[PDB]
Amino acid sequence: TPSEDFVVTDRGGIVENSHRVHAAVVDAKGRLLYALGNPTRMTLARSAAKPAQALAILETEGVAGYGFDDADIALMCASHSSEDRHIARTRAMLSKIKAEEADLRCGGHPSLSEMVNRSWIKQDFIPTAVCSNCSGKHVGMLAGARAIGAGTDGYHLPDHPMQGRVKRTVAELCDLDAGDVEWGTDGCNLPTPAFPLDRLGRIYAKLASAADGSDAGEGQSTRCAALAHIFRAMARHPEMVAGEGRYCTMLMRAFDGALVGKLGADASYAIGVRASDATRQLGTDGALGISVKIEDGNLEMLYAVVTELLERLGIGSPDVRSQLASFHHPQRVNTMGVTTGGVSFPFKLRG
Amino acid sequence: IDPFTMTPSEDFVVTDRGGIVENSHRVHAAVVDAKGRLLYALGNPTRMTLARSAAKPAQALAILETEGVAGYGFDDADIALMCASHSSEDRHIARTRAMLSKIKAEEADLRCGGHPSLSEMVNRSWIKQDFIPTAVCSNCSGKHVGMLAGARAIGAGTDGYHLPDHPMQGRVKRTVAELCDLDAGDVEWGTDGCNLPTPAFPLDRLGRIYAKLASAADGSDAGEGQSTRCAALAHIFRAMARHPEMVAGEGRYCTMLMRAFDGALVGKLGADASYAIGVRASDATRQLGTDGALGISVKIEDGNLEMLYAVVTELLERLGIGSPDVRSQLASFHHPQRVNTMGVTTGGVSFPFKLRGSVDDPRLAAVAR
Ligand SMILES: NC(=O)C[C@H](N)C(=O)O
Ligand SMILES: NC(=O)C[C@H](N)C(=O)O
């Protein structure tokens, strides 16, 4: 039943590569509104799960006492580029909980920004724990472990109360039983979840619906309040969520609060869209969630597809979306500056 | 699922994290004999495919068959560079300059452009020095010098040697079609990263080209009288196998593969994850059911290079080509490391594809896809 939905690159009209696309567009309750490919594909959310992990952090008893601010929370939600400012905020968050880099249980890695990495290579810099793109999430989990008086040495271990909280919080936001979320080990060495792709879109529709309810002044549950805070923090500090030149940062800056978006490693993407004229035209009375997976893991194709999807869905104005033109139709020019090909989207959204 | 209803559309290489599927990649492959007969396949063995740099031995043949080129005294290592996607190591740049000197041309005459090195270790050196690579650094620089050489030798004029209407490119186009045994209209052309025309043709015909390279080396080694074309194909095989480090560079798959096999085959990468291998006749080829040389071609549909090298190494194991000792020099490519930032292995690579050729119910259709 799932369609054969591809993004296709060409050289002079000749097919070069093709990439299978899965996508789910869901309403605030998770009802499926549109799809590409298999919208329930079992999928490792990777960093796209970080807002749910941030919720588990913020709901931990005592964490409020550390005084994390909106930018700090954004870093919790981040796959950052390890820019100097991300490292500086990581250290500033460590000081708030009276911890040090040696307490982190994540490891360093080449930067997610090629430009940052080239700067590191030029200076013989070896990245350390504090440079991890997940460093904000790890400081938050350290904070939560310290807050309830758990040991900090193994805050990252599955049998630690902090991961118990994380596991529970992910299943709850997905509206799934414990047994329907699978877990492996992330690149930062935390447990990391897999669940049907549509449930990733459900998380982000719940983020945006919470922001909507907070804007509207309602008897919001504390959990919705915290989801609303996470949404506001990501959209207020999108540079913390990724970095200069990064899709997530340029996307959220372009939309100036109308949505949040977040990358997952190996080419997953999630967007939470606040209710707008666009969502209403799409047939829902509330917020909307979008989740996308490129089957083979290609990031360049992910960003192209996501921006094409936003265009198909009518989300944003043409002028707003044109800020992402370089991601939507990636450059295909050779060493002599000649255009050799392009990218095409032969898929069709099914309602 | 069902082992008795498996299909080419299910030929995948798959990565996992703790057994949970991360990515999956469709595989296409063709294994052919020296006449192009299809012996084994994965996916769609006739997929229209841009050969990219895997066409370079065909381009090198067109260069070497250009009347007058023999006078320049290009040697075996020069020819291997014409066949190369090199790493832009200093020796590759130096040999490019040496070849330019042999034809009395200049770097300014190259019509290819620089790019980040194909080797991460070379590229790191460049980054430290803020070096901007130039034409002479192109991974295709040996091919371009050969094309310049051919243009000069025939009196054609060098300024547009890379353009489709230039005789050197007419010669390339004719030569590719001839080696593929295709009519001109069954080969399509686009423009490569190095700014030359680049061919696309059915994937099996890429294996056919390399089958012919290996077949020519067999005839040469055995002392058979050969056509000028077969003699030239045998020289190209010889050059690549004797100077595999010119064809790629240190740490590169093609180099390690050809060193490991020590003359038994040649192999060559094409950009966006194609691979071609020409295998001299051997006990292994005979057990696979042919009395001559063999060619192999592989394309990963989505273009992932790491998956290409794993698949190609798995395919050699499945074909019984090599020894476990020979192929174990390629172990790092065969099963790519999946180690996280804290030294913990998180997953791995698996090969749920099924070679077809020689078993199933006649009622199982093998729809190439
Ligand atoms: N951006 C990412 O998905 C990072 C991922 N959570 C990792 O640690 O590997
Ligand atoms: N390896 C490759 O295919 C290189 C390709 N011929 C290019 O133009 O760069």
Side-chain angles (χ1 to χ4, degrees):
Chain A
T1 140
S3 282
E4 296 289 295
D5 288 321
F6 294 80
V7 54
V8 177
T9 67
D10 72 279
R11 185 170 296 272
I14 308 163
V15 175
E16 183 99 68
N17 307 319
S18 66
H19 310 258
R20 183 176 295 272
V21 176
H22 309 279
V25 185
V26 304
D27 72 6
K29 307 269 180 72
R31 184 182 77 185
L32 194 60
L33 310 174
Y34 305 90
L36 294 182
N38 179 5
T40 64
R41 178 205 191 263
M42 177 61 85
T43 301
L44 293 149
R46 308 289 301 285
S47 276
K50 278 163 177 165
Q53 288 158 315
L55 174 66
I57 294 162
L58 291 169
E59 290 186 321
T60 297
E61 296 82 338
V63 168
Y66 294 129
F68 297 122
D69 62 10
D70 289 353
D72 294 337
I73 293 159
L75 199 75
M76 293 187 187
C77 295
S79 297
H80 62 69
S81 292
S82 313
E83 298 164 1
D84 287 1
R85 57 184 172 182
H86 301 122
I87 275 64
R89 186 167 292 283
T90 298
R91 294 185 166 145
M93 293 172 68
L94 284 171
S95 300
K96 286 183 172 176
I97 61 168
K98 304 189 185 175
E100 57 202 16
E101 304 181 14
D103 301 317
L104 295 170
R105 296 292 171 257
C106 48
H109 53 80
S111 171
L112 300 193
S113 163
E114 292 82 6
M115 181 173 302
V116 171
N117 210 47
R118 289 197 297 278
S119 179
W120 287 359
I121 286 164
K122 173 175 180 180
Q123 306 170 79
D124 296 312
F125 178 67
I126 302 153
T128 65
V130 82
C131 306
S132 165
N133 82 103
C134 300
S135 60
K137 168 175 61 170
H138 279 261
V139 174
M141 288 182 190
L142 263 174
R146 183 153 284 170
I148 59 164
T152 56
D153 175 51
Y155 72 79
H156 64 300
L157 296 175
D159 292 285
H160 188 281
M162 182 77 11
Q163 298 315 309
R165 278 137 190 272
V166 160
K167 287 195 170 55
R168 247 198 320 281
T169 303
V170 174
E172 292 172 353
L173 289 169
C174 289
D175 301 320
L176 292 164
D177 299 312
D180 297 331
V181 176
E182 298 168 14
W183 296 82
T185 299
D186 233 337
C188 67
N189 209 34
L190 284 168
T192 191
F195 41 82
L197 185 60
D198 67 296
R199 306 298 175 121
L200 181 58
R202 185 182 296 214
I203 290 171
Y204 282 68
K206 287 180 171 183
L207 280 171
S209 178
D212 277 344
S214 173
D215 223 75
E218 300 158 2
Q220 258 190 340
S221 63
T222 61
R223 169 160 291 183
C224 280
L227 288 166
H229 194 179
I230 292 166
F231 182 105
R232 181 184 76 178
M234 291 176 76
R236 205 161 89 78
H237 306 278
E239 68 276 17
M240 292 296 101
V241 177
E244 180 76 24
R246 294 274 305 279
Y247 189 79
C248 309
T249 295
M250 301 181 55
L251 172 70
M252 284 187 288
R253 264 167 189 171
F255 277 90
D256 196 37
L259 54 78
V260 297
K262 181 76 194 72
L263 173 70
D266 281 306
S268 285
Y269 209 78
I271 296 171
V273 180
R274 291 188 67 184
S276 69
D277 289 348
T279 64
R280 286 187 277 282
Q281 182 174 306
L282 291 169
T284 181
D285 57 4
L288 178 131
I290 303 159
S291 53
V292 177
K293 164 66 182 189
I294 305 307
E295 185 59 42
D296 54 87
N298 190 292
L299 260 164
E300 181 184 49
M301 296 296 98
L302 174 69
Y303 293 142
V305 166
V306 169
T307 314
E308 177 74 6
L309 215 16
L310 291 181
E311 188 166 68
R312 307 267 181 115
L313 296 170
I315 286 161
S317 62
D319 284 319
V320 166
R321 287 186 311 262
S322 73
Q323 300 185 26
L324 307 176
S326 74
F327 292 99
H328 186 188
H329 299 93
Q331 309 301 323
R332 282 294 183 273
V333 332
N334 68 12
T335 61
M336 299 295 287
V338 176
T339 309
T340 62
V343 174
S344 309
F345 307 103
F347 59 70
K348 304 158 69 138
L349 270 182
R350 53 192 200 268
Chain B
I1 47 93
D2 189 350
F4 305 103
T5 66
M6 298 309 295
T7 65
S9 71
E10 289 157 305
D11 283 334
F12 284 94
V13 53
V14 171
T15 60
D16 69 276
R17 184 173 301 275
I20 305 160
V21 173
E22 187 96 68
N23 307 320
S24 68
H25 311 254
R26 275 301 320 289
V27 181
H28 307 280
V31 182
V32 305
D33 77 5
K35 289 208 158 275
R37 170 169 75 100
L38 183 70
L39 302 180
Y40 302 86
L42 298 171
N44 176 9
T46 64
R47 172 196 194 270
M48 175 68 81
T49 301
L50 284 144
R52 305 294 296 291
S53 276
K56 278 170 184 172
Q59 288 159 304
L61 179 59
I63 295 158
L64 294 174
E65 291 183 329
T66 298
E67 293 88 338
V69 165
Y72 295 122
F74 290 130
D75 63 13
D76 282 0
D78 295 339
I79 298 167
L81 201 74
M82 299 181 187
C83 299
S85 302
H86 60 67
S87 281
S88 311
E89 304 168 354
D90 282 358
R91 50 183 173 177
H92 297 123
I93 298 172
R95 188 167 293 282
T96 301
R97 292 183 171 138
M99 292 176 64
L100 282 170
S101 297
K102 288 186 177 170
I103 74 169
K104 298 191 181 180
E106 320 266 42
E107 306 185 8
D109 299 310
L110 292 171
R111 291 293 173 269
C112 55
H115 54 75
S117 168
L118 293 184
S119 160
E120 208 118 76
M121 276 319 227
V122 174
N123 212 51
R124 298 190 206 292
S125 185
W126 291 1
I127 288 162
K128 288 187 191 211
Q129 306 166 352
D130 280 299
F131 176 71
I132 298 171
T134 64
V136 80
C137 304
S138 162
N139 79 108
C140 304
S141 59
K143 170 175 60 168
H144 281 257
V145 173
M147 300 282 164
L148 273 172
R152 279 258 171 103
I154 59 174
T158 50
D159 181 54
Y161 71 86
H162 62 305
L163 300 179
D165 70 303
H166 194 282
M168 283 312 298
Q169 297 315 318
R171 283 165 172 260
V172 168
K173 287 188 182 49
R174 193 162 51 249
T175 303
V176 170
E178 281 172 355
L179 293 168
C180 295
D181 302 317
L182 293 172
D183 296 320
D186 287 332
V187 181
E188 289 171 23
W189 296 84
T191 296
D192 234 335
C194 69
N195 211 26
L196 285 170
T198 191
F201 43 78
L203 183 57
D204 66 297
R205 306 298 171 120
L206 186 60
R208 188 187 296 217
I209 290 165
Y210 282 70
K212 288 181 177 175
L213 276 174
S215 186
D218 278 346
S220 179
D221 198 23
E224 308 170 359
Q226 284 183 315
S227 73
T228 60
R229 172 159 294 178
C230 281
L233 288 166
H235 195 180
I236 289 162
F237 186 106
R238 178 178 311 127
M240 296 180 72
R242 266 123 122 294
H243 302 276
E245 70 296 330
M246 292 295 97
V247 179
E250 288 307 305
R252 299 274 304 282
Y253 189 80
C254 310
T255 297
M256 299 180 64
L257 165 81
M258 284 188 290
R259 274 199 182 122
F261 277 93
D262 196 25
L265 52 75
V266 292
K268 181 73 188 83
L269 170 70
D272 282 302
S274 289
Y275 212 80
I277 293 173
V279 177
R280 293 188 61 193
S282 67
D283 235 293
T285 62
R286 294 190 280 283
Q287 291 178 26
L288 290 168
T290 184
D291 57 3
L294 194 137
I296 304 167
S297 52
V298 177
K299 158 70 177 191
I300 308 291
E301 181 62 34
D302 54 84
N304 188 292
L305 178 70
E306 181 184 49
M307 292 301 97
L308 174 77
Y309 295 143
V311 160
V312 167
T313 309
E314 173 68 14
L315 185 50
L316 291 170
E317 187 173 80
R318 295 214 192 168
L319 299 167
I321 294 168
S323 46
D325 325 58
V326 157
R327 289 179 316 253
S328 84
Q329 320 185 13
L330 305 180
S332 69
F333 295 100
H334 191 184
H335 307 98
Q337 295 288 113
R338 283 300 182 266
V339 177
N340 71 10
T341 62
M342 297 302 284
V344 180
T345 295
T346 55
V349 71
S350 53
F351 301 108
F353 58 75
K354 168 158 184 197
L355 202 63
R356 57 188 198 275
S358 182
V359 313
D360 298 308
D361 198 295
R363 290 170 300 184
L364 175 68
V367 184
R369 205 149 297 221

